[PDB]
Amino acid sequence: DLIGKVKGSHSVVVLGGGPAGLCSAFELQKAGYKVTVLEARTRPGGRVWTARGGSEETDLSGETQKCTFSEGHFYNVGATRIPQSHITLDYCRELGVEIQGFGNQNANTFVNYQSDTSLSGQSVTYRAAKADTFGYMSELLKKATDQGALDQVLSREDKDALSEFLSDFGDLSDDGRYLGSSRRGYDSEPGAGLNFGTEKKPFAMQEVIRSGIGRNFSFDFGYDQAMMMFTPVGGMDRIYYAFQDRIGTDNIVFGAEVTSMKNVSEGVTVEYTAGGSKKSITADYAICTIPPHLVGRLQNNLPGDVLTALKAAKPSSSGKLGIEYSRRWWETEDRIYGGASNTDKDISQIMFPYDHYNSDRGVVVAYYSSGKRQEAFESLTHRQRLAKAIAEGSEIHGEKYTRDISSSFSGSWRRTKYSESAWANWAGATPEYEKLLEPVDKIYFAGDHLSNAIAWQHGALTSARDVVTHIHERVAQ
């Protein structure tokens, strides 16, 4: 248990029913606090949003999209993947939310980059790219070692041990050269009898280096990205519907747009509009999880140095687009089951689904891009976004990318009401971040921006837990 049982009658109002808000309310309720959550949207989860058939969204440009994905088919427009260390998995267990493997690495997906080589714009599988890169890397370090270049820092025994590793890691010939490998894959698959198949031949050392085909390999090593990675069966939003149900909808007001938040003699008073009607609630403490750039728009009595600190958490651009295909060509033709293709094109990456394997249809994330390469979609209409995503995807996966398209749905987080940002980018552990960890009398800020895991649910959930702990210790004093 996070905290013990509270003695007496104590109330909290939670602004925002995303992960930080719902986790706060869940934990406070467990301990015996009175809690009310005010959420502007008509769904729980915030930047955890799962698009299915029937989903409707009107963005800040006034364009309304209506998702028409087939029954049971979806994609996560925000959060989609979870590493093994995150407390998100602990809450999945507590809430009874089934998880499954998320394909965050795949030998069969493609890399495709521009360069001053003949590989420019050419799709190469990860396994082929890796075998060539690690083959030539190993050959080069083995050459230097045999030449005696590392004799000052490696003993004879060190050199022999290193050589053994390099021959294995690079699949080097007996004389220490990279000549290609079964690790690259096969143009024709090995079968039975005298059907030996046909190995894919290697690129040259200069092609590999000058093409930069290994630029994305270190992604595999990210602490928060390395396999094994996980995701909830049926969508990430299931975590937050589970929180909703445990908290009880009697304790959550949806469609409730907060317009004012003030420290008062009697606690904290929050005004909000729900169903076109003006409402007000007062509680002993408030937990404000509204994104920091949106807090200054509220009528408030926050001190000037607090309003200035909130402005330091700069909005960031990111977005996604999902296409439902009526044929799972990526599985049938490319032998790709999950994972992502990676590119320097604006689409940035194409992410293939982790469910309905071997079914008749599925949703492909045709882009997940951020920063400059999301600015390139942000201002386009959905029809224009789709046309650009299909053109760029066809340059990676061929003309099959343009066929058997049923429907599509996009989100751009800077253009999304009640978000207007994918995640915070603090100006310059900064002074403004540290300032916002302190309560403003009875108002506490919480969210993934006030964590060391920004753009992870873990960040939001750990922020909620720390803030609930601080409120509880205060009440005990």
Ligand X SMILES: Cc1cc2nc3c(=O)[nH]c(=O)nc-3n(C[C@H](O)[C@H](O)[C@H](O)COP(=O)(O)OP(=O)(O)OC[C@H]3O[C@@H](n4cnc5c(N)ncnc54)[C@H](O)[C@@H]3O)c2cc1C
Ligand Y SMILES: N[C@@H](Cc1ccccc1)C(=O)O
Kindly state whether residue 455 participates in binding ligand Y, applying the rule CB under 6 A.
Answer: yes
Q: Which two tokens stand for residue 124?
A: 């190469």
Question: Could you tell me the CA-to-CA distances from 213 to 95, 170, 172, 397 in Å, in that order?
Answer: 42, 16, 20, 17
Q: According to the annotation, is 433 in a ligand binding site?
A: no
Question: Which range, of 325-333, 355-363, 390-398, 455-463, touches ligand X by CB under 6 A?
Answer: 455-463
Q: Distances in Å between the alpha carbon of 3 and those of 110, 147, 160, 441? A: 48, 63, 56, 22
Q: Is 41 annotated as a binding residue?
A: yes
For residues 63 and 168, which CB has a smaller minimum distance to its own copies in the complex? 168
Contact in structure between 348 and 376 (CB atoms under 8 Å): no
Cα distance between residue 61 and residue 420, in whole Å = 12
Task: Enumerate residues 29-48 that contact ligand X by CB under 6 A.
Answer: 38-41, 46-48
Binding mask 197-216 for ligand X (x = CB under 6 A): --------------------
User: H-helix or E-strand containing 383?
Assistant: helix 382-397
Q: Tell me: is residue 79 an annotated ligand-binding position.
A: yes
**Nearer Cβ to ligand X (97/137):** 97
How far is 241 from 19, CA to CA, in rounded Å? 10
Q: Kindly give, in sequence order, each residue whose CB lies less than 8 Å from that of residue 372, ignoring residues fewer than 6 positions away.
A: none
Spell out where the chain is interrupted, by the residue before each break (C to N > 2.5 A): 428
Instruction: Choose which of 455, 467, 468, 471 interacts with ligand X (CB under 6 A).
Output: 455
Q: Is 413 one of the binding residues for ligand X (CB under 6 A)? A: yes
Which of 336, 424, 448, 467 forms a contact with ligand X (CB under 6 A)? 448
473 interacts with, out of ligand X, ligand Y, its own copies, none, CB within 5 to 8 A per kind? none
**Identity of the residue numbered 458:** H
Residue from 216, 176, 206 nearest 341 by CA = 216
For ligand X, the closer of residues 124 and 424 by Cβ is: 424
Least gap, CB of 455 to ligand Y (angstroms): 4
247 in contact with ligand Y (CB under 6 A) = no
d(CA 358, CA 101) in angstroms, rounded, equals 16
Say which entry of its own copies, ligand X, ligand Y, none residue 38 contacts (CB below 5 to 8 A, set by partner kind).
ligand X
CB of 120 to its own copies, least distance (A): 14
Between CA 158 and CA 160 the distance in angstroms is: 6
Residue nearest to ligand Y (CB): 455
Q: How far does the chain reach from its first CA to its final CA, in angstroms?
A: 20
Does 456 bind ligand Y (CB under 6 A)? Our answer is yes
**Calpha distance 321→331 (Å, rounded):** 20
Q: Is 431 annotated as a binding residue?
A: no
Question: If binding is defined by CB under 6 A, does position 373 make contact with ligand X?
Answer: no
Specify the residue, 102 or 433, whose C-beta has the smaller distance to ligand Y: 102
81 part of the interface to ligand Y, by CB under 6 A: yes
Q: Residue ranges for the binding site for FAD?
A: 19-20, 39-41, 47, 78-81, 258, 448, 455-457
Binding-site ranges for ligand Y (CB under 6 A): 81, 225, 455-456
Q: Which residues are annotated as a binding site?
A: 19-20, 39-41, 47, 78-81, 225, 258, 368, 448, 455-457
